[PDB]
Design a protein around this ligand. Structure first.
Ligand SMILES: CCCCCCCCCCCCCCCCCC(=O)OC[C@H](COP(=O)([O-])OCC(O)COP(=O)([O-])OC[C@@H](COC(=O)CCCCCCCCCCCCCCCCC)OC(=O)CCCCCCCCCCCCCCCCC)OC(=O)CCCCCCCCCCCCCCCCC
Ligand SMILES: CCCCCCCCCCCCCCCCCC(=O)OC[C@H](COP(=O)([O-])OC[C@H](O)COP(=O)([O-])OC[C@H](COC(=O)CCCCCCCCCCCCCCCCC)OC(=O)CCCCCCCCCCCCCCCCC)OC(=O)CCCCCCCCCCCCCCCCC
Ligand SMILES: CCCCCCCCCCCCCCCCCC(=O)OC[C@H](COP(=O)([O-])OCC[N+](C)(C)C)OC(=O)CCCCCCCCCCCCCCCCC
Ligand SMILES: CCCCCCCCCCCCCCCCCC(=O)OC[C@H](COP(=O)([O-])OCC[N+](C)(C)C)OC(=O)CCCCCCCCCCCCCCCCC
Ligand SMILES: CCCCCCCCCCCCCCCCCC(=O)OC[C@H](COP(=O)([O-])OCC[N+](C)(C)C)OC(=O)CCCCCCCCCCCCCCCCC
Ligand SMILES: CCCCCCCCCCCCCCCCCC(=O)OC[C@H](COP(=O)(O)OCCN)OC(=O)CCCCCCCCCCCCCCCCC
Ligand SMILES: CCCCCCCCCCCCCCCCCC(=O)OC[C@H](COP(=O)(O)OCCN)OC(=O)CCCCCCCCCCCCCCCCC
Ligand SMILES: CCCCCCCCCCCCCCCCCC(=O)OC[C@H](COP(=O)(O)OCCN)OC(=O)CCCCCCCCCCCCCCCCC
Ligand SMILES: CCCCCCCCCCCCCCCCCC(=O)OC[C@H](COP(=O)(O)OCCN)OC(=O)CCCCCCCCCCCCCCCCC
Ligand SMILES: CCCCCCCCCCCCCCCCCC(=O)OC[C@H](COP(=O)(O)OCCN)OC(=O)CCCCCCCCCCCCCCCCC
Lengths: 80, 169, 318, 98, 104, 347, 171, 48
């Protein structure tokens, strides 16, 4: 496999760079630790309006004000 | 007049279709379909289909009608009554329809049609920081998975099919 | 007030196209160890004027045309597309600020092959039509890599907006993350405008450019100035696309000076490529597209899709 | 209904009756077929933009792609017919009467 | 609107240049001069059809800079790499079955 | 053709048919018809002679026109219903255009004018695919849109198809044109019972596909494309004359054979809905189909036409053709009438 | 059909916030920090009633609390705010990132003279809960009574009485 | 460099979108009174 690789790198290096770049593009996002943060940043970008909830009496995780402690936070995004 | 801009572009669209569909030659028919594709693109652009109108220019006129003119140039020779007669026939039918639906604000050929400018039927709200048309097209990759699979398979098969039937063996 | 802005776009385009002929003949002169024009004006500065006045009073050549209408419409379409490619160019402000300026320029450049095709139809020679079909196949071949390189670069931009591409390159030139895209872009735009070493119509490897052939052709100055408008425009577009300059929003002239100097250097790089290499054979630049550029362009397209996802560097839409 | 839909449907029927009445050239037939596709594209696009039906914004693109691949198939058929008979005339395609 | 004004101005300047370049050299009265199918190639048509089909594949690829903004990123990345891979597979079948030959 | 490419292209034909059969969205129906035509075009051009290029061009023009009328019917449906579910159509104009488009795809009269030309222009295997497999997807769409199908339109198409497919085959000596006019008459029989009971439509389609597959497989195994070439079969393989005899007697609708089953069930379900004149005229018109079937049996099995001398060399060689499922299809096309209440599995 | 019921022009009279969009965008983070409760009462009423005619009093309370917000800016920090929205107002895209020192001066003066804290990155997009006194809309779509469904199938599945009953087939 | 700067551009986009969100109740109130104003005007002129 080492003779074939050097032979195709001597004869057709454009195709070797092509298959190498394509293979890295395939197998690399499953190995990267920052692929999680792409999903996290896209789901944290507020396109719509945060339509509020009627306070029934039992919603301890939902804040009453945006500056309240409870709720989803983006400190991981400010820091990274 | 200016509130009727999509209507006037649609009249130019029908006039161009009567132009090439009366079939003078595939060269001039190609030219008429190019001018028709441009004005129908303008019709799409005046509703807010900016990406879809640029898809008309880039894909329809940009690739496909270029391939039609290319293949015409390989199959016709460079150097009537029926074409001009059918042209003025379609032009008179179209202008009589225009005259009816303008003087009456109503016509019925197959369906009932309003005669006012088509500005009336629009929405009165915004879409925020996106285009709804752009986001719906962008969802081809997250929602249109099966659609992408069958479209890519049909295009790969189409490449295979064209290489089969033009091979001659 | 807006028509003033349209005219101060489009008339300096024609003046820059006029003096690009002087810059070409001079820079190709000094690279060929000679001088360019220096007799007609002081340092040759009256050569474009004299040459344009000469071309506008010269007789329509000998022959007649197969189709009068396309013989008229091909220079009209060529000049109209060559002038409309400039209106979304952010320098630092585009004339027509549109959300889809990139896709507009890609579509209007895809429309430019109809001038070549209709001038091939309008000539009477069946050999000039073959040369036009070779040129059309060349240009539509390199439009593929134009589209895919442009898409791969815009994956770091976030949108099709050309003015956003100044904001994208505020920390670094975009040639640093995408130099293989940049060099295949530059050579593909070179092959777009029928520019040497890809000029097969104006050179040999051509069945009809062969001395005492037929083929009534259009007035040469119009297609020529459309072509040089396209050359300056594609170099300004490469400058915006890969070498985007510093923009102070209170001093737009700094960006205008900077992109102008870079666009002049890149157009002189076109001049310096055409005076350095022999021509491709036709199947050799078909080889260069279909077997060399397009595999790397698809591989780097996969790379630039998957790379902002794996690096958490997806650009914003707005 | 709206006034522009009349013109786009009438454009479809004009390119239909052009496609249903051949003169000589198969290329003009294919031009009428793709004019039918163009009118269908515009009509679907005006409906989908008018309705603000977001997901069907990808529908006219799929229409355009499939029917342009169909057009490529038809041009290859015309090319094989032209390499058989020298022209693209539909009166040369009459071997199957017997 | 300003786009339509600009398109009309570019079309008008182009038509004015074409009309001048045809009618201005007709001012000088010249000596009236009195003396005195194309071959098909399959490869020319095939490079145009290969262009058309890869251009449709590009038309599928053009909404990618908007498609990266989605919340379904794993599906999006899969289908993006799948469209570019099918374009590459179309190119490989065009390669290996002698389709890119003598216009390589 | 490369056998790999042949298998992939036949899988793409089948894939387009399956996409029409399973999908709930009109765009995917249209996509399935596009994929089906795009993949079946090389099967018609398998031998690369001008009759196959002419047949593929005529097939392309008809199926392309029908696909565009189908998309216009879909677009009028999106106007007048705002949605895309493959179910009834919410406008009689969309219903008329879609019934016309499917009538063009099936080659029912008066859109029948491509079927004998295209079937004559192509080989027997591709003609088999065209006359059996390509009938599946438009009958599935007609099966799904039947709450909106106009009755007078579909019965006009049906009786006109039966009559023109009866009179068309009486003048023919080419086997592929006989099978094509047989196709037109049987598609009339299928669509006549559609709005009354579509289970009997599926029964007619299944029995028709079995019998037509039997006849095309016998014509492939004997390598006979004309009547007079089929006439030499008694001196070459006499069992084949027996099989084409019983299969042509089946397709004519004679009891006790299984080709009587569909038309008897169609008459059975049309008299329930107080239609007497129409199944009687359909049954009397099918006697023309039986007439040219009996013409072929006279030329093949019941008499011995003169052969030539070179048949003696072909006596010394067996058939090395893969006569795939030919005994199974011959048994199912003839001896299935005692199993007539098996039709409930299609309910 | 029926007559649409509209409020009078007296019921649409309110003291508007007649400022420009750069004045609002410059003040938007402190406006979202301070004018939270009438705004979220209004947006809850607006997504629940699905009718702008049932939301006019909450719209007037929004339009009143916004005026109290800008009056409270105008009494203490009119000049840093004016410099800051002028700098926001120069930009054609109205960038926050071109204006960080004027934002710093405005936030400094606002935190000192009014005690207001600018929201962090992530807070004004939180989903909050609203305590209301108005009732929940029981039929906001004004849907009429749904049709009664077809009966379900029930019972054990017996064999067919004398089989298929197809003309003579005794099974 | 593009990693650091596109992450900064995403944080700036979130700041812009939060400014929009904080302004949406006021704009929705003005839009509701706007459309009810115009419909009441059309209703009165339809009555006359
Ligand atoms: C369920 C629906 C089934 C539909 C039919 C499926 C098979 C046909 C499709 C594929 C095909 O053509 O295969 C060749 C095909 C034979 O057709 P042929 O080309 O005419 O060959 C004739 C000679 O017999 C070939 O002979 P040979 O010398 O080459 O080798 C002998 C061969 C060797 O056998 C094998 O190799 C089999 C063992 C391996 C199997 C595969 C393993 C992987 O054995 C046979 O062929 C014996 C006959 C098998 C029966 C054929 C017909 C099947 C029944 C069809 C449905 C009938 C329904 C009637 C309903 C009536 C009321 C409505 O099938 C086989 O070879 C195997 C058949 C297995 C039948 C299983 C039935 C139950 C399935 C559940
Ligand atoms: C402890 C555990 C084990 C206990 C075991 C207990 C049993 C021990 C014996 C085991 C063997 C049992 C065999 C079957 C039972 C008998 C069935 C029967 O006769 O039904 C009478 C059936 C009705 O008469 P039935 O008096 O109401 O019922 C008496 C029993 O209670 C009939 O009972 P059913 O009421 O339940 O009958 C049900 C129903 C009763 O039927 C009905 O409801 C009426 C509908 C019948 C079909 C009508 C079709 C009309 C159009 C087609 C015309 C075909 C023409 C004849 C054939 C032409 C040449 C192929 O039958 C059917 O639906 C089946 C369809 C007919 C097939 C009959 C069985 C054949 C098996 C052997 C086949 C060999 C080839 C024979 C020829 C092929 C055609 C039959 O009559 C006919 O179907 C007429 C034809 C005669 C049937 C075949 C006779 C069976 C033995 C044949 C041996 C000789 C073969 C010669 C060489 C090959 C031919 C060249
Ligand atoms: C924007 C400003 C300008 C940008 C730069 C451009 C300025 C310089 C211009 C110079 C003059 C060029 C004139 C035209 C020349 C045309 C001919 C030519 O060059 O043909 C191209 C040649 C063609 O090949 P060839 O013809 O020379 O070689 C023979 C080819 N075969 C074997 C097929 C017969 O090369 C290419 O196609 C290269 C294209 C760009 C390569 C990008 C490389 C990326 C590398 C990534 C890493 C690789 C390592 C391995 C993987 C590692 C993974 C971690
Ligand atoms: C703006 C971009 C650049 C545009 C071009 C530059 C601007 C100048 C445009 C006008 C150039 C001069 C007039 C046309 C050329 C005349 C040359 C010539 O041979 O003329 C002889 C011709 C004919 O002369 P003749 O009668 O002796 O004919 C000689 C030929 N025989 C004898 C065989 C018939 O002159 C004219 O026709 C006169 C034209 C008008 C003169 C100028 C009027 C004002 C124009 C503004
Ligand atoms: C060839 C197959 C290529 C696709 C492989 C799977 C890609 C993927 O992520 O699919 C998930 C996607 C989407 O799943 P998902 O998990 O994103 O769904 C979440 C719901 N939405 C979309 C609303 C966000 O597709 C499916 O689950 C179904 C469609 C494809 C089904 C398989 C097709 C096979 C074709 C064979 C011929
Ligand atoms: C897995 C990730 C996804 C992979 C798919 C995506 C690919 C993206 C790139 C697109 C390429 C499109 C075109 C591909 C055509 C391949 C066939 C080919 O070119 O074969 C011919 C070639 C010899 O060239 P020839 O025909 O002679 O050319 C004329 C000049 N001599 O033959 C050769 O040169 C040999 C070609 C095969 C061997 C190449 C090996 C490259 C290895 C690189 C490192 C590993 C990368 C990971 C992928 C696995 C590779 C085995
Ligand atoms: C955005 C910037 C664009 C810039 C575009 C222009 C670039 C070049 C600038 C000009 C450079 C210098 C030009 C000098 C030309 C020659 C002048 C001259 O004196 O020519 C001599 C000639 C005959 O003179 P004669 O009387 O015979 O003298 C005998 C003396 N005993 O006398 C004559 O022929 C008569 C006088 C002719 C003068 C011509 C001058 C140049 C005109 C060019 C046209 C454009 C002008 C600028 C427009 C844009 C800016 C406002
Ligand atoms: C042989 C014949 C003669 C040949 C020479 C002349 C014709 C060829 C050259 C002209 C080509 C014209 C192309 C014009 C449309 C380009 C697409 C477009 O409009 O993009 C700009 C922009 C999209 O950006 P976006 O920001 O999303 O939209 C604005 C909303 N904020 O969208 C907008 O700004 C929308 C503006 C309103 C809609 C403009 C419609 C223009 C008029 C109709 C088409 C005219 C051309 C017809 C003929 C074409 C060629 C045959
Ligand atoms: C009533 C049914 C028809 C409705 C439209 C009528 C349009 C006027 C044409 C009437 C028929 C004229 C005719 O003879 O057409 C045949 C012609 C093909 O014949 P060609 O080869 O040109 O010349 C040999 C003569 N047979 O074929 C053609 O020229 C076809 C041109 C069709 C283009 C239609 C344009 C719009 C017509 C109005 C709207 C529908
Ligand atoms: C509601 C309905 C849902 C769907 C239900 C199922 C519908 C089934 C429809 C069947 C349609 C079959 C069409 C024909 C097969 C397609 C593939 C093909 O062409 O195979 C033939 C093959 C090709 O070989 P080739 O070499 O190219 O041919 C020239 C001769 N040397 O080889 C040959 O030419 C060799 C000769 C023999 C070929 C015999 C093939 C018979 C296949 C059909 C069997 C019967 C159908 C299944 C049972 C009934 C189902 C309803």
């Amino acid at each position: 496999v080492a003779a074939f690789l050097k032979n195709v790198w001597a004869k057709e290096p454009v195709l070797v760079a092509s298959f190498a770049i394509a293979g890295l593009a395939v197998i690399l996002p499953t190995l990267s630790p920052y692929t999680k943060y792409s999903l996290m940043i896209n789901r944290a970008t507020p396109y719509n309006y945060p339509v509020p909830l009627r306070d029934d009496g039992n919603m301890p995780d939902v804040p009453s004000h945006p500056q309240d402690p409870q709720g989803p936070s983006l400190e991981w995004l400010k820091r990274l | 007049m200016m509130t009727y801009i999509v209507f006037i572009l649609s009249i130019i669209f029908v006039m161009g279709f009567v132009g090439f569909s009366s079939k003078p030659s595939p060269i001039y028919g190609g030219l008429g379909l190019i001018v028709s594709g441009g004005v129908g693109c303008g019709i799409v652009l005046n509703f807010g289909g900016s990406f879809l109108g640029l898809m008309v220019f880039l894909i329809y006129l940009g690739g496909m009608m270029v391939v039609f003119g290319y293949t015409t140039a390989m199959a016709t020779e460079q150097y009537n009554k029926v074409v001009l007669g059918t042209f003025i026939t379609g032009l008179l039918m179209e202008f009589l329809m225009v005259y009816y639906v303008l003087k009456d604000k109503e016509v019925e050929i197959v369906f009932k049609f309003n005669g006012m400018g088509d500005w009336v039927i629009y929405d009165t709200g915004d879409s925020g920081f996106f285009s709804e048309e752009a986001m719906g097209i962008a969802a081809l990759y997250s929602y249109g998975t099966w659609l992408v699979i069958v479209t890519g398979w049909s295009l790969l098969i189409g490449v295979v099919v064209i290489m089969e039937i033009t091979r001659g063996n | 007030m807006f028509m003033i802005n349209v005219l101060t776009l489009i008339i300096p385009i024609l003046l820059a196209v006029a003096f690009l002929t002087l810059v070409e003949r001079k820079v190709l002169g000094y690279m060929q160890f000679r001088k360019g024009p220096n007799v007609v004006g002081p340092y040759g500065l009256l050569q474009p004027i004299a040459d344009a006045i000469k071309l506008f009073i010269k007789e329509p050549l000998r022959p007649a045309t197969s189709s009068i209408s396309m013989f008229i419409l091909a220079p009209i379409l060529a000049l109209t597309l060559a002038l409309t490619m400039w209106i979304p160019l952010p320098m630092p402000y585009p004339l027509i600020n549109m959300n889809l300026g990139v896709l507009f320029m890609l579509a209007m450049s895809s429309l430019a092959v109809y001038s070549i095709l209709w001038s091939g139809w309008a000539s009477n020679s069946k050999y000039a039509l073959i040369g036009a079909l070779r040129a059309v196949a060349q240009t539509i071949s390199y439009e593929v890599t134009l589209a895919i390189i442009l898409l791969s670069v815009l994956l770091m931009n976030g949108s099709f907006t050309l003015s956003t591409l100044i904001i994208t390159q505020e920390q670094v030139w975009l040639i640093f993350p995408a130099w293989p895209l940049a060099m295949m872009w530059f050579i593909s735009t070179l092959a777009e405008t029928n520019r040497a070493p890809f000029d097969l119509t104006e050179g040999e490897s051509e069945l009809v450019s062969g001395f005492n052939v037929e083929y009534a052709a259009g007035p040469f100055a119009l297609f020529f100035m459309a072509e040089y408008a396209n050359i300056i425009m594609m170099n300004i577009f490469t400058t915006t696309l890969f070498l985007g300059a510093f923009h102070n929003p209170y001093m737009p002239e700094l960006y205008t000076i900077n992109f102008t100097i870079k666009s002049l250097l890149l157009s002189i790089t076109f001049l310096w490529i055409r005076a350095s290499y022999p021509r491709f054979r036709y199947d050799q630049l078909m080889h260069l597209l279909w077997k060399n550029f397009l595999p790397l362009t698809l591989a780097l397209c996969m790379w630039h899709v998957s790379l902002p996802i794996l690096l958490s560097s997806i650009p914003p839409q707005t | 209904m709206s006034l522009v839909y009349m013109n786009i449907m009438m454009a479809f029927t004009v390119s239909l009756t052009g496609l249903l009445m051949y003169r000589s050239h198969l290329m003009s037939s294919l031009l009428c077929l793709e004019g039918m596709m163009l009118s269908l594209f515009i009509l679907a696009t005006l409906m989908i933009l008018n309705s603000h039906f977001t997901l069907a914004s990808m529908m006219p693109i799929i229409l355009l792609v499939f029917a342009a691949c169909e057009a490529a198939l038809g041009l290859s058929l015309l090319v094989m017919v032209s390499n058989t008979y020298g022209t693209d005339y539909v009166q040369n395609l009459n071997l199957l009467q017997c | 609107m300003n786009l339509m004004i600009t398109l009309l101005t570019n079309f008008t300047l182009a038509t004015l240049l074409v009309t001048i370049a045809f009618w201005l050299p007709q001012l000088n009265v010249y000596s009236e001069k009195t003396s005195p199918r194309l071959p098909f190639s399959m490869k020319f048509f095939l490079v145009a059809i290969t262009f058309l089909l890869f251009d449709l594949e590009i038309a599928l690829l053009l909404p990618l800079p908007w498609a990266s903004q989605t919340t379904n990123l794993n599906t999006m990345l899969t289908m993006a790499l799948l469209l570019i891979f099918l374009l590459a597979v179309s190119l490989a079948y065009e390669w290996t079955q002698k389709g890119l030959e003598w216009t390589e | 053709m490369n056998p790999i490419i042949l298998i992939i292209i036949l899988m793409t034909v089948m894939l387009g048919t399956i996409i029409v059969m399973i999908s709930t969205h009109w765009l995917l129906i249209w996509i399935g018809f596009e994929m089906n035509m795009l993949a079946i075009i090389p099967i018609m051009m398998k031998k690369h002679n001008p009759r196959a290029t002419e047949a593929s061009t005529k097939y392309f023009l008809t199926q392309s026109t029908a696909s565009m009328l189908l998309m216009m019917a879909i677009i009028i449906n999106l106007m007048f219903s705002g949605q895309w579910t493959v179910m009834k159509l919410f406008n009689p104009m969309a219903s008329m255009l879609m019934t016309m488009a499917l009538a063009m795809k099936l080659g029912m009269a008066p859109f029948h004018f491509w079927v004998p030309e295209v079937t004559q222009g192509i080989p027997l295997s591709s003609g088999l695919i065209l006359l059996t497999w390509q009938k599946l997807a438009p009958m599935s769409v007609l099966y799904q849109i039947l709450p909106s199908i106009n009755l007078d339109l579909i019965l006009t198409l049906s009786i006109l198809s039966i009559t023109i497919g009866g009179w068309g085959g009486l003048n023919q000596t080419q086997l592929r044109k006989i099978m094509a006019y047989s196709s037109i008459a049987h598609m009339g029989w299928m669509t006549a019972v559609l709005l009354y009971n579509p289970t009997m439509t599926l029964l007619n389609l299944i029995i028709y596909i079995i019998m037509t597959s039997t006849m095309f497989t016998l014509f492939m195994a004997n390598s006979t494309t004309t009547t007079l070439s089929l006439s030499h079969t008694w001196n070459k393989a006499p069992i084949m004359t027996i099989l084409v005899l019983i299969t042509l007697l089946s397709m004519g609708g004679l009891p006790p054979l299984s080709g009587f089953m569909p038309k008897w069930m169609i008459i059975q379900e049309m008299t329930k809905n107080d239609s007497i004149i129409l199944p009687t005229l359909m049954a009397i018109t099918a006697l023309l189909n039986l007439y040219f079937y009996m013409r072929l049996t006279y030329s093949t099995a019941l008499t011995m036409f003169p052969s030539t001398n070179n048949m003696k060399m072909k006596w010394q060689f067996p058939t090395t053709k893969r006569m795939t499922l030919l005994p199974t299809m011959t048994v199912l096309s003839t001896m299935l009438l005692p199993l007539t209440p098996i039709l409930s599995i299609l309910e | 059909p029926g007559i649409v019921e509209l409020p009078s022009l007296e019921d649409l009279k309110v003291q508007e916030v007649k400022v420009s969009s750069s004045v609002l965008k410059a003040a938007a983070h402190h406006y979202g920090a301070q004018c939270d409760k009438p705004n979220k009462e209004f947006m809850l009423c607006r997504w629940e009633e699905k009718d702008p005619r049932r939301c006019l009093e909450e719209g007037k309370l929004v339009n009143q609390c916004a005026l109290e917000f800008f009056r409270q800016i105008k009494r203490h920090c009119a000049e840093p705010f004016t410099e800051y929205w002028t700098c926001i107002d120069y930009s054609g895209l109205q960038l926050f990132r071109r204006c960080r020192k004027e934002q710093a001066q405005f936030d400094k003066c606002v935190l000192d003279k009014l005690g207001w804290v600018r929201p962090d990155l992530g807070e004004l997009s939180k989903v909050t809960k609203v305590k209301t006194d108005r009732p929940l809309p029981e039929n906001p779509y004004h849907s009429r009574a749904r049709p009664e469904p077809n009966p379900e199938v029930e019972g054990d599945l017996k064999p067919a009485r004398h089989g298929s009953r197809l003309f003579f087939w005794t099974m | 460099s593009m990693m650091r700067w596109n992450r900064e551009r995403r944080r700036l986009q979130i700041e812009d979108f939060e400014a929009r969100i904080a302004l949406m109740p006021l704009l929705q109130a003005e839009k509701d009174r706007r459309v009810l104003q115009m419909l009441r005007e059309n209703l009165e002129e339809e009555a006359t």
